Short mmCIF file of C-alpha atoms (C1' of nucleotides) in Angstrom, two decimals:
data_model
loop_
_atom_site.label_atom_id
_atom_site.label_comp_id
_atom_site.label_asym_id
_atom_site.label_seq_id
_atom_site.Cartn_x
_atom_site.Cartn_y
_atom_site.Cartn_z
CA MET A 1 9.04 -19.16 -4.95
CA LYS A 2 10.96 -17.41 -7.61
CA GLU A 3 10.81 -16.35 -11.73
CA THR A 4 11.44 -18.31 -14.47
CA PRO A 5 15.58 -18.53 -15.86
CA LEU A 6 16.78 -16.83 -18.38
CA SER A 7 18.51 -19.40 -21.23
CA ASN A 8 21.29 -18.95 -23.13
CA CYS A 9 19.27 -19.11 -26.08
CA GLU A 10 17.60 -16.01 -26.13
CA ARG A 11 19.73 -13.34 -25.27
CA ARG A 12 22.02 -14.66 -28.19
CA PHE A 13 18.90 -14.20 -30.22
CA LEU A 14 18.04 -10.02 -28.43
CA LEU A 15 21.77 -9.75 -29.35
CA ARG A 16 21.90 -11.19 -32.92
CA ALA A 17 18.47 -8.61 -33.51
CA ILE A 18 19.90 -5.58 -31.68
CA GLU A 19 22.82 -5.72 -33.72
CA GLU A 20 21.29 -5.95 -36.68
CA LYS A 21 18.46 -2.87 -35.47
CA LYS A 22 15.03 -5.26 -35.52
CA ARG A 23 13.36 -5.94 -32.50
CA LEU A 24 10.69 -9.24 -31.74
CA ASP A 25 7.59 -6.90 -31.71
CA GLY A 26 8.30 -4.66 -34.80
CA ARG A 27 8.62 -1.55 -33.36
CA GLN A 28 11.65 0.14 -34.71
CA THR A 29 14.22 2.03 -32.49
CA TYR A 30 12.74 5.42 -31.44
CA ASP A 31 9.29 4.17 -30.72
CA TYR A 32 6.81 3.74 -27.97
CA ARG A 33 3.94 1.11 -27.46
CA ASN A 34 1.08 2.76 -28.21
CA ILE A 35 -1.35 3.98 -25.21
CA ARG A 36 -5.01 3.51 -23.78
CA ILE A 37 -6.18 5.89 -21.06
CA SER A 38 -9.64 4.80 -18.80
CA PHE A 39 -11.08 6.95 -16.39
CA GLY A 40 -13.53 6.00 -13.56
CA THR A 41 -16.30 7.89 -12.10
CA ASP A 42 -15.07 9.54 -8.99
CA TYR A 43 -12.92 12.62 -9.72
CA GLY A 44 -8.77 11.29 -9.43
CA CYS A 45 -9.07 7.86 -10.98
CA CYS A 46 -7.86 6.96 -13.70
CA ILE A 47 -6.25 3.56 -15.80
CA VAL A 48 -2.85 3.76 -17.91
CA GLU A 49 -2.03 0.86 -20.66
CA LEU A 50 1.76 1.82 -21.62
CA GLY A 51 2.30 -1.80 -24.09
CA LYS A 52 1.21 -4.43 -21.88
CA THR A 53 1.36 -2.65 -18.40
CA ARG A 54 -1.49 -1.75 -16.17
CA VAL A 55 -1.17 0.92 -13.77
CA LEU A 56 -3.57 2.28 -11.23
CA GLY A 57 -3.58 6.32 -10.22
CA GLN A 58 -5.96 7.67 -7.68
CA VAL A 59 -5.84 11.03 -5.48
CA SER A 60 -7.70 11.76 -2.74
CA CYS A 61 -7.18 14.68 -0.10
CA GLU A 62 -8.18 15.15 3.51
CA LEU A 63 -7.93 18.04 6.04
CA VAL A 64 -5.36 18.44 8.83
CA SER A 65 -3.64 20.73 10.67
CA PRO A 66 -0.08 21.60 9.26
CA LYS A 67 2.70 20.87 11.04
CA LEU A 68 5.29 23.30 12.59
CA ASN A 69 6.89 26.37 10.07
CA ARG A 70 5.49 26.50 6.46
CA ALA A 71 2.31 27.86 7.68
CA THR A 72 0.90 28.56 4.47
CA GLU A 73 1.12 25.63 2.35
CA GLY A 74 0.13 21.96 2.08
CA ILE A 75 2.00 18.95 2.31
CA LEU A 76 1.69 16.07 -0.26
CA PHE A 77 2.29 12.46 0.63
CA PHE A 78 3.04 9.80 -1.90
CA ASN A 79 3.27 5.84 -1.58
CA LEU A 80 4.54 4.09 -4.23
CA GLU A 81 3.57 0.20 -3.79
CA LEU A 82 4.21 -3.70 -5.95
CA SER A 83 1.35 -5.50 -6.20
CA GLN A 84 2.32 -9.27 -5.74
CA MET A 85 0.18 -9.75 -9.10
CA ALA A 86 2.42 -7.50 -10.98
CA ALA A 87 4.76 -10.48 -11.62
CA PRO A 88 5.91 -13.68 -10.04
CA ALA A 89 8.50 -12.39 -7.75
CA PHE A 90 7.41 -9.33 -6.25
CA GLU A 91 6.81 -10.18 -2.56
CA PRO A 92 5.48 -8.24 0.42
CA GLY A 93 9.01 -7.42 1.73
CA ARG A 94 11.22 -9.09 0.12
CA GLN A 95 12.33 -6.65 -3.12
CA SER A 96 13.24 -3.76 -0.72
CA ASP A 97 15.79 -2.55 -2.89
CA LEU A 98 13.83 -1.81 -5.73
CA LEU A 99 10.84 -0.12 -4.00
CA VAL A 100 13.09 2.67 -2.79
CA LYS A 101 14.54 3.65 -5.67
CA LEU A 102 11.27 3.81 -7.84
CA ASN A 103 9.77 6.24 -4.84
CA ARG A 104 12.46 8.54 -4.52
CA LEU A 105 12.28 8.58 -8.71
CA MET A 106 8.55 9.15 -8.19
CA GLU A 107 9.09 11.93 -5.56
CA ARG A 108 12.07 13.91 -7.00
CA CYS A 109 10.43 13.82 -10.50
CA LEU A 110 6.81 15.52 -9.13
CA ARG A 111 7.60 17.37 -5.77
CA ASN A 112 11.21 18.86 -6.58
CA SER A 113 10.13 20.10 -10.24
CA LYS A 114 7.02 22.54 -8.60
CA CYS A 115 4.42 21.90 -10.83
CA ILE A 116 1.52 21.66 -8.52
CA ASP A 117 0.86 24.68 -6.41
CA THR A 118 1.00 24.12 -3.01
CA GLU A 119 0.63 27.81 -1.99
CA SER A 120 -3.13 28.27 -3.03
CA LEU A 121 -4.09 24.80 -0.55
CA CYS A 122 -4.89 26.67 2.83
CA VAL A 123 -8.16 27.74 4.68
CA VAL A 124 -6.49 29.34 7.44
CA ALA A 125 -2.82 29.33 8.81
CA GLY A 126 -1.87 27.59 12.13
CA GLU A 127 -5.06 25.89 11.28
CA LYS A 128 -6.35 23.44 8.87
CA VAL A 129 -5.56 22.83 5.38
CA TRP A 130 -5.78 20.47 2.45
CA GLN A 131 -3.27 17.63 2.90
CA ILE A 132 -3.50 15.77 -0.42
CA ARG A 133 -2.16 11.97 -1.11
CA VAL A 134 -1.39 10.48 -4.25
CA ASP A 135 -1.93 6.28 -4.42
CA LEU A 136 -0.62 4.35 -7.57
CA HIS A 137 -0.74 0.83 -7.53
CA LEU A 138 1.27 -1.50 -10.03
CA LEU A 139 -0.69 -4.41 -11.65
CA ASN A 140 1.24 -5.84 -14.75
CA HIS A 141 4.73 -6.23 -14.98
CA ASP A 142 5.36 -5.84 -18.38
CA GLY A 143 8.51 -3.69 -18.84
CA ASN A 144 8.50 0.66 -18.38
CA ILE A 145 7.35 0.77 -15.27
CA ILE A 146 8.61 4.15 -14.59
CA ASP A 147 7.17 5.58 -17.65
CA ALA A 148 3.83 4.65 -17.14
CA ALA A 149 3.63 5.24 -13.29
CA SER A 150 4.82 9.12 -14.06
CA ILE A 151 1.79 8.94 -16.75
CA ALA A 152 -0.64 7.79 -14.31
CA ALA A 153 0.12 10.27 -11.78
CA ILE A 154 -0.09 13.21 -14.32
CA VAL A 155 -3.55 12.31 -15.23
CA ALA A 156 -4.72 11.16 -11.55
CA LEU A 157 -3.56 14.91 -10.76
CA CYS A 158 -4.78 16.82 -13.64
CA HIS A 159 -8.40 14.81 -13.28
CA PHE A 160 -8.84 15.44 -9.93
CA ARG A 161 -11.45 18.02 -8.07
CA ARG A 162 -11.25 19.12 -4.52
CA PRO A 163 -14.67 19.87 -2.11
CA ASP A 164 -14.74 23.60 -1.43
CA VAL A 165 -15.19 26.11 1.46
CA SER A 166 -16.53 29.37 2.26
CA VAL A 167 -14.32 31.54 4.46
CA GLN A 168 -15.39 34.87 5.83
CA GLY A 169 -14.59 36.73 8.91
CA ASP A 170 -13.32 34.03 11.43
CA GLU A 171 -15.66 31.28 10.21
CA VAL A 172 -15.07 28.20 8.69
CA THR A 173 -17.91 26.15 6.60
CA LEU A 174 -17.80 22.85 4.13
CA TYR A 175 -19.97 22.23 1.49
CA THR A 176 -20.58 19.15 -0.70
CA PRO A 177 -21.68 18.51 -4.68
CA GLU A 178 -24.93 19.54 -3.80
CA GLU A 179 -24.54 22.52 -1.92
CA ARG A 180 -20.72 23.67 -3.94
CA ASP A 181 -19.53 22.72 -7.38
CA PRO A 182 -16.14 20.76 -6.66
CA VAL A 183 -12.96 22.79 -8.08
CA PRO A 184 -9.82 21.85 -10.43
CA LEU A 185 -6.67 22.58 -9.22
CA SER A 186 -3.60 24.31 -10.50
CA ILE A 187 -1.35 22.74 -12.38
CA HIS A 188 2.23 24.60 -13.48
CA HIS A 189 3.84 22.13 -15.97
CA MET A 190 3.79 18.50 -16.55
CA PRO A 191 6.73 16.62 -15.99
CA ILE A 192 6.88 13.25 -17.68
CA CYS A 193 9.66 10.22 -17.40
CA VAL A 194 11.33 8.79 -20.48
CA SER A 195 13.67 6.11 -19.74
CA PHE A 196 16.53 4.75 -22.53
CA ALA A 197 18.69 1.35 -22.25
CA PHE A 198 21.95 0.49 -23.07
CA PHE A 199 23.26 -2.73 -24.85
CA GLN A 200 26.62 -4.33 -25.36
CA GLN A 201 28.30 -1.52 -23.83
CA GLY A 202 26.72 1.73 -25.12
CA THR A 203 27.14 1.19 -28.51
CA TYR A 204 23.70 0.65 -29.07
CA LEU A 205 20.31 2.13 -27.60
CA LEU A 206 16.52 1.47 -27.39
CA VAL A 207 14.04 3.21 -26.79
CA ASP A 208 11.47 2.14 -24.64
CA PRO A 209 12.36 -1.53 -23.71
CA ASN A 210 10.03 -4.23 -21.90
CA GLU A 211 10.76 -7.17 -19.39
CA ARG A 212 12.88 -9.40 -21.78
CA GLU A 213 15.26 -6.35 -22.98
CA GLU A 214 16.06 -5.49 -19.44
CA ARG A 215 17.19 -8.70 -19.27
CA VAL A 216 19.91 -8.33 -21.50
CA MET A 217 20.61 -5.07 -21.01
CA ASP A 218 23.49 -3.19 -19.07
CA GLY A 219 22.51 -0.28 -17.39
CA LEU A 220 19.33 2.35 -17.99
CA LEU A 221 19.38 5.85 -18.22
CA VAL A 222 16.07 8.00 -16.84
CA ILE A 223 15.29 11.42 -17.48
CA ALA A 224 12.62 13.32 -16.72
CA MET A 225 11.54 16.93 -18.54
CA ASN A 226 8.43 18.52 -18.54
CA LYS A 227 7.07 20.62 -21.31
CA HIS A 228 7.94 23.48 -23.30
CA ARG A 229 11.80 23.09 -23.35
CA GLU A 230 13.10 22.38 -19.41
CA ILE A 231 14.66 18.74 -18.27
CA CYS A 232 13.87 18.00 -14.31
CA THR A 233 15.62 14.83 -13.64
CA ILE A 234 18.46 12.61 -14.90
CA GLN A 235 19.16 9.07 -13.30
CA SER A 236 22.13 6.71 -14.85
CA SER A 237 21.72 3.75 -13.14
CA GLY A 238 22.83 -0.38 -13.91
CA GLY A 239 25.76 -1.15 -15.22
CA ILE A 240 26.53 1.44 -17.72
CA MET A 241 29.05 3.75 -18.44
CA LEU A 242 28.59 7.11 -20.55
CA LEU A 243 29.45 9.44 -22.85
CA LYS A 244 28.72 13.17 -23.12
CA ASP A 245 27.54 13.67 -26.78
CA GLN A 246 24.81 10.15 -25.82
CA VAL A 247 23.96 12.78 -22.82
CA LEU A 248 22.60 15.38 -25.00
CA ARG A 249 21.45 12.53 -27.96
CA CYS A 250 19.38 11.48 -25.14
CA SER A 251 18.04 15.19 -24.06
CA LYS A 252 16.73 15.50 -27.63
CA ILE A 253 14.94 12.10 -27.59
CA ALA A 254 13.34 12.87 -24.42
CA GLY A 255 12.32 16.62 -25.63
CA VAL A 256 11.18 14.89 -28.93
CA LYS A 257 8.87 11.90 -27.13
CA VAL A 258 7.72 14.51 -24.06
CA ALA A 259 6.46 16.72 -26.99
CA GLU A 260 4.56 13.93 -28.62
CA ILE A 261 3.30 12.50 -24.86
CA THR A 262 1.98 15.61 -23.68
CA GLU A 263 -0.21 15.59 -27.18
CA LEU A 264 -1.62 12.35 -26.86
CA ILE A 265 -2.51 13.48 -22.53
CA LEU A 266 -3.69 16.80 -23.76
CA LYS A 267 -6.45 15.13 -26.21
CA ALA A 268 -7.76 12.71 -24.33
CA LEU A 269 -8.29 14.99 -21.34
CA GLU A 270 -10.11 16.88 -23.14
CA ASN A 271 -12.54 14.73 -24.98
CA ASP A 272 -12.80 12.79 -21.59
CA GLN A 273 -14.30 16.40 -20.52
CA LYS A 274 -16.07 16.78 -23.48
CA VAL A 275 -17.83 13.43 -22.70
CA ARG A 276 -18.55 14.50 -18.92
CA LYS A 277 -19.95 17.65 -20.09
CA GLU A 278 -22.41 16.40 -23.25
CA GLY A 279 -24.20 14.21 -20.97
CA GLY A 280 -23.58 10.86 -21.88
CA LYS A 281 -22.70 7.67 -19.87
CA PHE A 282 -19.00 7.48 -18.69
CA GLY A 283 -17.06 5.17 -16.14
CA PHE A 284 -15.10 1.78 -15.77
CA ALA A 285 -18.18 -0.32 -16.63
CA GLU A 286 -18.80 1.15 -20.12
CA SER A 287 -15.14 0.65 -21.12
CA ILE A 288 -15.34 -3.20 -22.01
CA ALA A 289 -14.80 -3.74 -25.11
CA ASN A 290 -17.98 -6.10 -26.53
CA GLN A 291 -16.53 -7.29 -29.92
CA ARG A 292 -14.49 -9.42 -27.44
CA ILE A 293 -15.63 -13.03 -26.24
CA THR A 294 -15.26 -12.22 -22.21
CA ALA A 295 -17.80 -9.47 -21.76
CA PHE A 296 -21.25 -9.70 -21.13
CA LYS A 297 -24.24 -7.05 -20.40
CA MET A 298 -27.03 -7.70 -18.79
CA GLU A 299 -30.05 -5.00 -17.63
CA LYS A 300 -31.70 -5.00 -13.98
CA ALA A 301 -33.67 -8.31 -12.73
CA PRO A 302 -36.05 -8.85 -10.23
CA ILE A 303 -35.74 -12.28 -9.61
CA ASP A 304 -38.59 -13.36 -7.87
CA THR A 305 -38.86 -11.89 -4.22
CA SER A 306 -42.91 -13.51 -4.03
CA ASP A 307 -42.19 -16.16 -1.53
CA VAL A 308 -40.13 -15.98 1.01
CA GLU A 309 -42.46 -14.97 3.65
CA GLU A 310 -43.82 -17.87 3.59
CA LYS A 311 -40.26 -20.14 3.56
CA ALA A 312 -39.34 -18.34 6.40
CA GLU A 313 -43.39 -18.39 8.33
CA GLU A 314 -42.95 -21.94 8.07
CA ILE A 315 -38.95 -22.53 9.02
CA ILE A 316 -39.49 -20.93 12.33
CA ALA A 317 -43.07 -22.67 13.14
CA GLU A 318 -41.49 -25.88 12.06
CA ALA A 319 -39.01 -26.35 14.51
CA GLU A 320 -38.27 -27.22 18.46
CA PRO A 321 -39.17 -24.75 20.91
CA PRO A 322 -36.38 -24.05 23.65
CA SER A 323 -36.15 -26.34 26.58
CA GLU A 324 -37.22 -25.79 30.26
CA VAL A 325 -34.21 -27.09 32.52
CA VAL A 326 -33.45 -24.20 33.73
CA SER A 327 -30.06 -23.94 35.60
CA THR A 328 -28.99 -22.79 39.40
CA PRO A 329 -26.18 -20.36 40.36
CA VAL A 330 -24.64 -21.05 43.52
CA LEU A 331 -22.65 -18.83 45.60
CA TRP A 332 -19.28 -19.47 47.60
CA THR A 333 -18.75 -16.08 48.84
CA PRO A 334 -19.69 -12.38 47.33
CA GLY A 335 -17.42 -11.80 44.36
CA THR A 336 -17.20 -15.88 43.08
CA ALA A 337 -20.16 -17.84 41.86
CA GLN A 338 -20.46 -21.50 39.77
CA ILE A 339 -22.55 -23.05 37.63
CA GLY A 340 -22.38 -26.28 36.26
CA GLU A 341 -21.60 -29.62 37.41
CA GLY A 342 -20.55 -28.06 40.62
CA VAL A 343 -17.95 -29.22 43.13
CA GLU A 344 -18.23 -31.55 45.97
CA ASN A 345 -16.69 -29.21 48.88
CA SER A 346 -17.84 -25.82 50.24
CA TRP A 347 -13.81 -25.24 49.22
CA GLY A 348 -10.76 -27.14 49.80
CA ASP A 349 -8.29 -26.60 52.96
CA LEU A 350 -5.79 -28.84 54.27
CA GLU A 351 -6.10 -30.70 51.45
CA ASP A 352 -2.31 -31.40 51.58
CA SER A 353 -1.12 -29.96 54.97
CA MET B 1 47.69 29.83 -1.93
CA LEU B 2 43.99 30.12 0.20
CA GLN B 3 43.86 30.29 4.11
CA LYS B 4 40.44 28.58 5.29
CA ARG B 5 39.35 30.31 8.34
CA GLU B 6 36.16 29.47 10.82
CA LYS B 7 33.07 32.39 11.42
CA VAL B 8 30.88 31.06 13.90
CA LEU B 9 27.26 32.79 14.42
CA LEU B 10 23.99 33.38 16.48
CA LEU B 11 20.66 33.25 14.49
CA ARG B 12 17.70 33.79 16.23
CA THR B 13 14.57 31.97 14.69
CA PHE B 14 11.07 33.29 14.38
CA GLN B 15 10.04 30.48 16.93
CA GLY B 16 12.56 32.20 19.40
CA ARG B 17 15.11 29.24 18.25
CA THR B 18 18.48 30.69 18.03
CA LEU B 19 21.58 28.37 16.82
CA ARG B 20 25.56 28.61 17.13
CA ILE B 21 25.83 27.93 13.11
CA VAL B 22 29.68 27.75 12.00
CA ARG B 23 30.41 28.30 8.23
CA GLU B 24 33.69 29.23 6.55
CA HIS B 25 36.17 31.95 5.14
CA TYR B 26 38.67 31.90 2.88
CA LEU B 27 41.48 34.59 2.32
CA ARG B 28 43.74 35.40 -0.42
CA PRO B 29 47.18 36.86 -1.24
CA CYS B 30 45.83 39.83 -3.76
CA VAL B 31 42.71 41.40 -3.44
CA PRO B 32 42.66 44.05 -6.55
CA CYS B 33 42.78 47.68 -4.99
CA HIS B 34 41.46 49.64 -8.38
CA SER B 35 44.05 51.95 -7.87
CA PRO B 36 45.84 54.05 -10.31
CA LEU B 37 48.86 53.96 -8.15
CA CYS B 38 48.93 50.07 -7.24
CA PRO B 39 52.79 49.65 -7.46
CA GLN B 40 52.32 46.14 -9.53
CA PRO B 41 49.69 45.95 -12.24
CA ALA B 42 49.47 42.13 -12.77
CA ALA B 43 49.23 40.82 -9.77
CA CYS B 44 45.14 41.56 -9.98
CA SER B 45 45.40 43.81 -13.58
CA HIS B 46 42.62 45.77 -12.50
CA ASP B 47 39.67 44.31 -14.80
CA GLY B 48 36.62 46.60 -13.66
CA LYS B 49 36.08 50.49 -12.87
CA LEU B 50 39.26 52.38 -12.32
CA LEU B 51 39.73 55.55 -10.79
CA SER B 52 41.85 58.73 -12.03
CA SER B 53 44.14 60.48 -9.75
CA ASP B 54 43.30 63.94 -9.28
CA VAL B 55 41.97 64.78 -5.88
CA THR B 56 43.85 65.89 -2.86
CA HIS B 57 42.57 63.62 -0.51
CA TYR B 58 39.96 60.40 -0.20
CA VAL B 59 37.63 59.76 2.22
CA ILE B 60 36.43 56.49 3.72
CA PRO B 61 33.26 56.69 6.27
CA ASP B 62 34.20 54.09 8.50
CA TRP B 63 30.16 52.24 8.62
CA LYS B 64 27.96 54.97 9.84
CA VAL B 65 28.31 57.87 7.80
CA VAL B 66 27.32 55.75 4.68
CA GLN B 67 24.71 54.20 7.10
CA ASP B 68 22.70 56.93 7.65
CA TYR B 69 24.46 60.35 5.61
CA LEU B 70 24.48 57.92 2.06
CA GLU B 71 22.14 60.64 0.98
CA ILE B 72 25.26 63.15 0.63
CA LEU B 73 27.51 61.31 -1.15
CA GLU B 74 26.28 61.33 -4.37
CA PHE B 75 26.84 64.73 -5.44
CA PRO B 76 29.08 64.64 -9.02
CA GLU B 77 31.45 66.73 -7.18
CA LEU B 78 32.56 64.89 -4.59
CA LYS B 79 35.75 62.68 -6.28
CA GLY B 80 37.58 59.95 -4.66
CA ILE B 81 35.37 57.44 -2.86
CA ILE B 82 36.38 54.17 -2.24
CA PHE B 83 33.47 51.62 -0.17
CA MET B 84 35.06 48.98 2.54
CA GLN B 85 33.13 45.58 2.20
CA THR B 86 32.49 45.40 5.85
CA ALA B 87 30.22 48.86 5.39
CA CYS B 88 28.30 47.48 2.68
CA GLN B 89 27.31 44.54 4.85
CA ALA B 90 26.88 46.51 8.40
CA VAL B 91 24.25 48.47 6.05
CA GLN B 92 22.85 45.45 4.25
CA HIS B 93 22.15 43.53 7.52
CA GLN B 94 21.16 46.62 9.18
CA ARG B 95 18.98 48.82 6.90
CA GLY B 96 16.90 46.37 5.06
CA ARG B 97 16.89 46.67 1.39
CA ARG B 98 16.49 50.12 0.14
CA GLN B 99 18.94 52.25 1.16
CA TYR B 100 21.34 49.28 0.27
CA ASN B 101 19.66 49.13 -3.15
CA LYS B 102 20.75 53.34 -3.39
CA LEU B 103 23.87 52.35 -2.40
CA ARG B 104 25.14 49.45 -4.87
CA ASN B 105 23.55 51.80 -7.58
CA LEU B 106 25.62 54.08 -6.69
CA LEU B 107 28.49 51.54 -6.96
CA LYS B 108 27.59 50.34 -10.20
CA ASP B 109 27.20 53.37 -11.81
CA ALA B 110 30.50 55.18 -14.08
CA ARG B 111 29.43 58.48 -12.79
CA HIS B 112 30.76 58.78 -9.87
CA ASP B 113 34.27 57.82 -8.31
CA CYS B 114 33.10 54.70 -6.17
CA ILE B 115 34.61 51.56 -5.95
CA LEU B 116 34.53 48.52 -3.55
CA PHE B 117 37.15 46.62 -1.54
CA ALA B 118 37.66 43.01 -0.14
CA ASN B 119 38.70 44.39 3.42
CA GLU B 120 37.73 40.97 4.69
CA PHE B 121 39.12 38.50 1.90
CA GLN B 122 42.48 40.00 2.01
CA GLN B 123 44.96 38.27 4.44
CA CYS B 124 46.76 41.09 6.81
CA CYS B 125 43.57 43.19 7.22
CA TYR B 126 41.37 40.75 8.37
CA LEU B 127 41.28 40.40 12.22
CA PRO B 128 40.31 37.79 14.45
CA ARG B 129 37.31 39.21 17.72
CA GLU B 130 39.72 39.07 21.21
CA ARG B 131 38.25 38.77 24.74
CA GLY B 132 35.25 41.66 25.47
CA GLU B 133 34.11 43.33 22.18
CA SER B 134 31.06 44.17 20.29
CA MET B 135 30.21 44.98 16.73
CA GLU B 136 31.26 49.12 17.07
CA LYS B 137 34.76 48.38 18.60
CA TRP B 138 35.60 45.35 16.03
CA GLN B 139 34.12 47.27 13.21
"C1'" U C 1 69.15 -54.25 -38.10
"C1'" U C 2 66.09 -49.31 -33.95
"C1'" U C 3 62.85 -52.63 -28.19
"C1'" U C 4 60.05 -51.51 -23.23
"C1'" U C 5 58.00 -47.79 -20.08
"C1'" U C 6 55.99 -42.81 -17.58
"C1'" U C 7 47.30 -42.10 -13.81
"C1'" U C 8 42.91 -38.04 -14.42
"C1'" U C 9 38.45 -32.52 -16.15
"C1'" U C 10 37.33 -29.08 -6.45
"C1'" U C 11 34.93 -32.09 -2.62
"C1'" U C 12 29.93 -29.65 -0.45
"C1'" U C 13 23.98 -28.14 0.25
"C1'" U C 14 17.60 -29.64 2.97
"C1'" U C 15 19.88 -20.77 5.75
"C1'" U C 16 16.65 -17.45 10.16
"C1'" U C 17 14.83 -12.02 9.64
"C1'" U C 18 9.32 -8.88 13.61
"C1'" U C 19 9.44 -2.03 8.56
"C1'" U C 20 7.02 2.92 6.64
"C1'" U C 21 5.81 10.40 3.10
"C1'" U C 22 8.87 14.09 5.16
"C1'" U C 23 13.52 15.71 7.06
"C1'" U C 24 16.90 21.62 8.71
"C1'" U C 25 16.40 29.41 8.98
"C1'" U C 26 17.21 34.51 5.99
"C1'" C C 27 15.17 41.22 9.14
"C1'" U C 28 12.72 45.71 9.72
"C1'" C C 29 9.90 48.17 5.07
"C1'" C C 30 6.51 57.16 3.69
"C1'" U C 31 0.32 53.99 -0.65
"C1'" C C 32 0.74 62.16 -3.21
"C1'" U C 33 -3.98 66.30 -2.95
"C1'" U C 34 -12.24 69.37 -5.54
"C1'" U C 35 -14.82 66.98 -1.09
"C1'" U C 36 -18.37 66.37 2.43
"C1'" U C 37 -18.95 60.67 1.58
"C1'" U C 38 -23.64 60.27 -3.49
"C1'" U C 39 -28.44 58.27 -2.36
"C1'" U C 40 -35.96 59.10 -4.10
"C1'" U C 41 -37.45 58.26 -9.06
"C1'" U C 42 -39.24 54.97 -13.94
"C1'" U C 43 -38.26 52.03 -17.86
"C1'" U C 44 -33.97 45.05 -17.54
#
RNA sequence: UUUUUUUUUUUUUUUUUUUUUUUUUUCUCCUCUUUUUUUUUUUU
């Protein structure tokens, strides 16, 4: 199946709007759609909602032997994936020219910026070291997949907590959250992507565009730049032909926006840590809105487990026992035996000769 | 203008793996000679540290006299020293980083008569190896 | 007192596909000075 086609009235409508500098959902040019984070119960699990897009991030680590060369570091897989439910079009093996640019954007940003400290993730050298493996999923496609995926990966990596080990002499030992307390990670900086769309040959731009605005646009400019004032990746693409003052304006915009986004992320992580430390209740369950029609709560219930013995007993007692015609096995020659109606002769011989 | 040439190399890695890496080299017409009797100023314009002619002579170690005897060539009475970059490269790739750091401080100093020369980036001082050789003899 | 005739917007649609983080170097390296090494003890 494919996606609904685009009419010739929506294009006209978006472009008269954009010329007039007013958008459908009210937000002005240099605005984001507000964000909403939600944390799981086990560490390294979060749900981010940018506008109406959803991404699920989940980090997990595991212990392997560290290849050959680079004997004193650890490896860091990544695997983006696009879920059929994100949008009708996404299909397991028919969108192979977006997956590549997306995985690449994500990997170049996260792994070349050198914000995670993969130095101090060893146990021995030449021997077992921790191999982390981030995982993100797209749940609902409404435009700007990469900003949401980046914020999700950031929060998921800044909320993980490893296991922990004791190493002394030449001897190993592996603990558990009851034997020893899980340990956080070390994060130098926080590289956060920003995207820009250009409209009618670079004459206008719009910050944080959604999927309809994405079908009436020429090309895209992404600018990933960590906190402080340090740019980390840019990737122009689509159909655009750019100037040189504009790259600088964009860099300013990304600076401002990443400042604000880092404010939000830090505040949310702090509040979450405070909640987890106070001693209150957390998790995916205690996030469902209760002022809303599609949520319901029920404490536990013994249903009545008073009768099952009797029913089972009568059922077993009330049915016909196994019968008693026992069959016989026939022996032809050691190696082959037959049971059933059997064959008339001992074996075939000179049937046709 | 420039004249491309090549340089093969035999790098031995820590795991015992050697390789014939090939690399580049770009000659030039005019390597500055940082002397006060260069018979044409403009072509290089001598934009750096520049000697003043009072000495009787000029002494250039070939490679070893600066490899080990370097500790001699600091006395501010010694005058008129010029270093060939090929000796610097030898000492760097043979004597680690300490001796070389003293040598580069020596160079980067307005107290002595030390300059550096681009032997290997000059168009008729470069010579290619031949059948049967060694670093010492080629050097 | 000025008749009659001079065509026009390409034809076509009912195509198969059995992969998967990365990717590829940089050498040997002088740690300065009262010592053997003190040690019970009690108040946390």
